[PDB]
From a paper:
We determined structures for three new crystal forms of E. coli HslU or HslUV by molecular replacement. Our new structures were similar to previous ones with the notable exception that a trimeric plug, formed by residues 183–206 of the I-domain, completely blocked the axial channel of the HslU ring. Additional hydrophobic packing contacts within the plug included Val184 and Ile186 from the extended region, which occupy peripheral grooves between plug helices, and Met202 from the helix. The negatively charged side chains of Glu193 and Glu194 following this turn were also close to the positively charged side chains of Arg101 (94% conserved) and Lys293 (92% conserved) in the HslU axial channel, suggesting that favorable electrostatic interactions also stabilize the plugged conformation.
HslUV consists of one or two AAA+ HslU6 ring hexamers and the double-ring HslV12 peptidase. To reach the axial channel of the HslU hexamer, substrates must transit a funnel-like structure formed by segments of its intermediate (I) domain.
Author numbering:
A (entry chain F), C (entry chain F), E (entry chain F): 2 to 88, 94 to 123, 152 to 164, 185 to 206, 225 to 265, 270 to 443
B (entry chain E), D (entry chain E): 2 to 88, 93 to 139, 151 to 167, 217 to 263, 268 to 443
């Protein structure tokens, strides 16, 4: 895509609220992709992706930026927990990214084949018509062996139209050129002064960012120009605790601000397909019409902020648990309330929540 | 390649700055490869690669020399962290991953030779349906013109490239080429070898050395692409050796590293050179990148001087990461231009010393913030 | 081979310097091989190889004796570090030995097929003419499955002349009859009083020497008559610390003496293809002629002995690091010095080395 | 085999010296196999092998009895160290490795039967090209004579041995024979079982016993060669039992070892017998080996007496390894003759008591040296 | 089978001596099987097997009851040591049970094909006539791959008569309906207050009893209606120490009494194919006739009880070691004693045993 950095941020504002510095940082990395293609043969090999390190408390949108970014560029995407490797091989990151790129380009290939998939009597009828047991590591291998053994109209036409050798070669080029990976909670593999096992994971991840080659059943993939987005609260450790070889491979740094009560009020409504809009369409399925007052949206955001300050701050994720606890009575009766217009006023919010928010011992369970 | 040792160093000077001793040492190893092939049948077996042990602080260009060296020789290359084997994976995976890189290397390079001939015969194939045969016919050329001018039909040209490139390629000559490329030209870089030197960990630390021993003394490893022998593979080990010393390595390993070299720490003056002198230096990279948006950036000598001073202060204020600090500092300076470069099309921007201090000095002043941002 | 023990030692003297007791011991074991074949059917099963245990400091030639011995008998050979199994199965020793025996008999089969590989116009032109992804353990298995899937003029003729069923059956008989294995640093698996894991390796190695059967993709190999050569400094532990079942399986013992300065002077020159001869041929490739004075060879041996006495004694391996440090200037300028005769006198040795040998702190790095 | 228990002991006396109780105990187990086959369908299932537990110091011939016993019965055999499973490998590998030994055993023995008939039909095949058919013809014999006299042609005789031996062999009768050989005749020796007796290690020690339990109580193990049942396999466990006792074994395991026997320690007199009396004794072995070089060695009775005394002193001076000490002492005495035997062809050497003391007493006197050399 | 609970116990009395409460408990579980089949479609899914937990010292017959029970019902059977999983997957229990069910139904299928497997000259002659190397986990997989590669008159007829698709489908129905599993020494995986690894095994076994599905090369097996019989001394821990999810899945509990001297006297003779009867038939093979006096049988039982009270009580298993120690002289001379009638009187028992039983230090080895 040829979108300029401001055009990228403007699209991210349709989903993510605030955190513009993180939006500006990801826009720079995605714009350098298009900038690299316009360069000559020599510079395209020397220039490498400007990988980003997001820093901030949980639930502030570090992942949603990476998700919407890859969804914006139609790029292959995967999220991985860095701690998973403290105990799987690191090369699986590129494998799973390709398997997602395969299904992505494949279902997209069906889209091109879908729409392809007269006598007066011809139009008349046309109008009326309208076992192999293996350990877990090789379970995917025995799958392919079983599919090889089995080998030895929408389905037959789409198979006739599709080019399987093209879809497999394309997904590699979609990964080598446009791929994106998100390494969540990278701060937890930094040295606490386990430090050998923690820093050992950093060394195992190093070739993926330094440019290496990973074999896959779909083909041979190179990790040279893949973009990476690490994230971590970095409250315990600091980015300087990362190994020097890794710090130099994350040229862009950014800190995401903690969300405020006003941000919660915006997140509930402004973003496209916001959670409040979702239940409004859900209750519309039952014939019920729900409407949230601005005071009702205010106290909901006020309720989530209190739980985060009372016990544990989980970020905007607290909005999900609170909203479902508020609408639980409506969602159950929504079948019997068909044809009725329900209003979520400030009194309705205080009725279903203030008794719960007041008891911190209960808030740790119900919310 | 038949390059003489001075020709190797001069090419390395186009990328690496300074560290001439490490350049001279790697040049001797690569020259011994060509010197060996000229020898008789007996001496070619007895002579073994002169493996090198790089020593110095991190980020001084130890790996870059090995990378540019293998790229100069078009040789298979892989960087392996010696600490990966402390936990576990088998050591033989080094040769396995090296061949996989050599497979993709010889394959993509073989596509470069097939990129040309395939288009000719693919044109001859597609012209057989337009002008079926019963000097080129005049209609054979009249269609050949409209084809090159541009035009399932359009999908068919891509399918013939595969069938012709597969017909032109010799897989037994290709999959066996990567084996010849590994056995004859292969190169391996073993980073942070000093950390496996020497009671509990000393057994597991030195155990990794003995697992690595057959690879340098010569052995044979089985791979899915074939059977590879490691007798003539060149190896480059590196380590800071501040906690331990090369003498702490097992004696069988000290004798397999005949060349030793220490790399000097980079100075502020070297940072200024790294920013500009090397071919496709990072400052040149950002210049051509902003050029893509139609902006012309230019760095003043004092502007370059203050970036190197900025990266040096962070390395001294907190942690010294070598010349890697130049990358984090530069993008932090250019982040405002890189975002606005779309709206700044047609303008000539100048990175002066005042601009560098405006965007950086406030950050370098706070060491608490430098650890997070730089 | 029908070589007598003195004929074996005489050939080993062409490579190894001194250490005659170890040369005499290996000659006895190799001669018993030929002696066993002349015996009747009963005694050939009861007699077992006289395995040897070499004892001495590192770098005194314990391995070179085993290497030249197997190279002298054209026998399959492999070196293994006993500590590798403290963390691979022990049966891999026989597998890798066969894979080396296969490549040995195979390239030797090409030698027999190589030389096999008129009209006046006939002689005239004759004159003008002149993806499957698996864990690391089964990577070799998927190789064979991939080679089976692919199955389902020098190359075509050598394949037409060779007998693949013969080469595979021969390599087994070459292993079962003439095979040799070298177990380096066996002293490190003795009990230090880990002792369970150390002695556990001794128990795992026991069936290989007591006569057992190991399966291999090339075939079923028996370890009855394979010769073994263990080695260890035995400075910490002693051979009596080995398990009793293992001590009885090593009937021959020998101690290799520490090399002296005079031995270094001999090792540099006397052995065939000595290291000094190697660089002389290497510098001859550049058109340069190097010549070492007897005083120059003396001070080189004197230099290596000082480093071994100053910090750590690595045996004759110190000669390699010292010599390359001395010739580093010549090896770099050898291109520009074409047609010149360079002499390595005693002054040249003292110029490039005495400054380094004097500083022990630097000798631990550069040498 | 239908050998009676006394016939078994008498054959074991040809190899093992003394230890008659262990010979009588193993003979009862092997005789019960033949006794079971004579029984009806019901009793053959209910009766199970009388497993034996050998007890005594190392090197007294516990394993040799089990080896000669299985070799006497031509039965599959394997020795497994019980401590191997403390770390890990599965216990079922015992039956897997046993079948692999039984596969090679029945295969090489099947080659012995095919060694004969194949040569006859291979001759009939090669005579068809010399005298193509349109009582043996006179030319059929005239070529058969020149063939047996000796002579691709020479390579062809080897290829027909494979095709005929493969045609003569019945693989379903062979690969299934090794299964019958394991199930009906299989024997397993479990060395040092006393070391897995009984808090931390006691769970892992006794855990191995419970993993071994299904093999003796009866079970079924899957192998690549087939499906094997362990109900009728004989087992022989051994251990010094100085740290622990057989009562320390798990109760389900004590009941599966109905026969118990203690092996006495070997004396100096027994060493003298071991050197000479057993068939193909080591002294006989060195005699026939020096014979190959054309030397005739002869050991005096006092010379044999002083070798046994030499091995005994080392076992008492340092570590007692049993009769294994005889091997290390003997070769150390014969190492000078074994090297010179080529030049000594045609001479009669005599190993007297003076010769034994000349080469050994200096070594036995220094206990510091005996640990390294003997 | 339609056997009533008393008919089951009456058959168990032919092998097991006493312990009637355990015989009554297993009879109830086997009778509920037949009772479930007579129920309607709904109740057959809701009713689940009444699993039993046997409690008592070792060697009192806890396993023989389970063995004879499965042999009585011709059901597939397997015994497993719960401690084996403290270090194999638990799903292997169902796999090995099916492999035993396959061989069971297969050899039973040969029985149906066995009996199927005229001119005067016809009756006359009729009268005169009368390499792939894998780690241990996938060794069974490579077996099937090797058998697939090989694929690509009693034997040919039985193969022609048998229905291989029927034998594989039947063994699953034989497991899903009639299967039985015995988990020995379940008391050792209870918490001692390892407790995580011990109770972790209890959680891994839970789905097998709670009704789950286990894949197998023979087919997909369901563990819903499989009967299970756990056993343990429960001297250290108690059944209440088991996890609550497991206690509810063992509705039947029973304690097996310690065997007395009188029971040993009965076990030696009364059970069908008793050990004394076995040696009588064994010595009959040698032409010898052995006969045990009631006083001889008495002192044998008295001897075994003394060893159990002196050192360690192994239950009725002590009878095996004692009897073989008594008959060792006869079993060796039985060949030379052909045609003789030997009597095992009380004096014969005291002669061969009292010297051994008196020495407790020797009893720990010989007996
Ligand atoms: N700025 C924001 N705008 C809109 N939604 C947000 C924002 N920040 C957080 N959220 C919501 O909260 C959740 C944040 O989770 P996530 O971004 O995965 O955590 P983190 O940011 O710690 O990686 C998302 O489900 C998202 O819908
Ligand atoms: N002499 C040099 N010339 C140019 N760039 C350098 C030099 N030394 C270091 N760099 C830069 O700093 C980084 C050094 O990292 P690397 O060489 O991998 O570390 P090490 O030298 O410790 O192995 C590289 O990204 C490289 O671009
Ligand atoms: N007696 C000798 N004669 C010739 N070269 C020797 C001798 N001893 C050692 N060397 C040299 O030193 C090295 C010895 O290493 P090696 O024999 O593998 O160590 P070790 O003897 O401890 O096993 C060899 O490369 C060999 O060239
Ligand atoms: N009674 C004996 N007769 C002959 N040789 C014996 C005897 N006892 C021991 N040996 C010799 O000593 C060694 C004993 O080792 P082994 O029997 O395996 O040990 P263990 O008896 O402890 O299992 C064998 O090599 C054997 O040749
Ligand atoms: N009541 C009994 N009747 C007959 N034999 C018994 C009885 N109890 C024990 N036995 C014998 O003792 C042994 C008991 O072992 P087992 O039942 O497996 O131990 P546990 O009962 O502890 O599981 C069996 O071999 C059996 O022959």
């Amino acid at each position: 895509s040829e979108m300029t950095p401001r055009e990228i941020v403007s699209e991210l504002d349709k989903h993510i609220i605030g955190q513009d510095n993180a939006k500006r940082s990801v826009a720079i990395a995605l714009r350098n992709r298009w900038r690299r293609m316009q360069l000559n043969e020599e510079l395209r090999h020397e220039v490498t992706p400007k990988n980003i390190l997001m820093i901030g408390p949980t639930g502030v949108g570090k992942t949603e930026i990476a998700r919407r970014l890859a969804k914006l560029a139609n790029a292959p995407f995967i999220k991985v927990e860095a701690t998973k490797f403290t105990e799987k091989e690191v090369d699986s990151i590129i494998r799973d990214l390709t398997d997602a790129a395969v299904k992505m380009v494949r279902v997209q290939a069906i889209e091109k084949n879908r729409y392809r998939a007269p006598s007066a009597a011809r139009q008349a009828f046309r109008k009326k018509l309208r076992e192999i047991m293996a350990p877990p590591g090789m379970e995917e291998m025995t799958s392919q062996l079983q599919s090889m053994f089995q080998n030895l109209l929408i389905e037959e036409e789409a198979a006739k139209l599709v080019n399987p050798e093209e879809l497999k070669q394309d997904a590699i080029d979609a990964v080598e050129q446009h791929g994106i990976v998100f390494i969540d909670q990278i701060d937890k593999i930094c040295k606490r002064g386990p430090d050998v096992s923690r820093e050992g994971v950093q060394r195992d991840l190093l070739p993926l960012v330094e440019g290496c080659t990973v074999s896959t059943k779909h083909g041979m993939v190179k990790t040279d120009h893949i973009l990476f987005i690490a994230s971590g609260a970095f409250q315990i450790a600091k980015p300087s605790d990362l190994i020097p070889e890794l710090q130099g491979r994350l040229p862009i740094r950014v800190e995401l601000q903690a969300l405020t009560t006003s941000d919660f009020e915006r997140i509930l409504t402004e973003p496209n397909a916001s959670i409040t809009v979702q239940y409004k369409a859900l209750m519309a399925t039952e014939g019920v019409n729900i409407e949230f007052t601005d005071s009702g949206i205010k106290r909901i955001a006020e309720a989530a902020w209190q739980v985060n300050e009372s016990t544990e701050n989980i970020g905007a994720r607290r909005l999900h648990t609170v909203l479902e606890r508020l609408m639980e009575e409506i969602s159950y009766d929504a079948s019997d309330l068909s044809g009725q217009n329900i209003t979520i006023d400030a009194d309705y919010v205080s009725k279903h929540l203030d008794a719960l928010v007041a008891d911190e011992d209960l808030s740790r369970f119900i919310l």
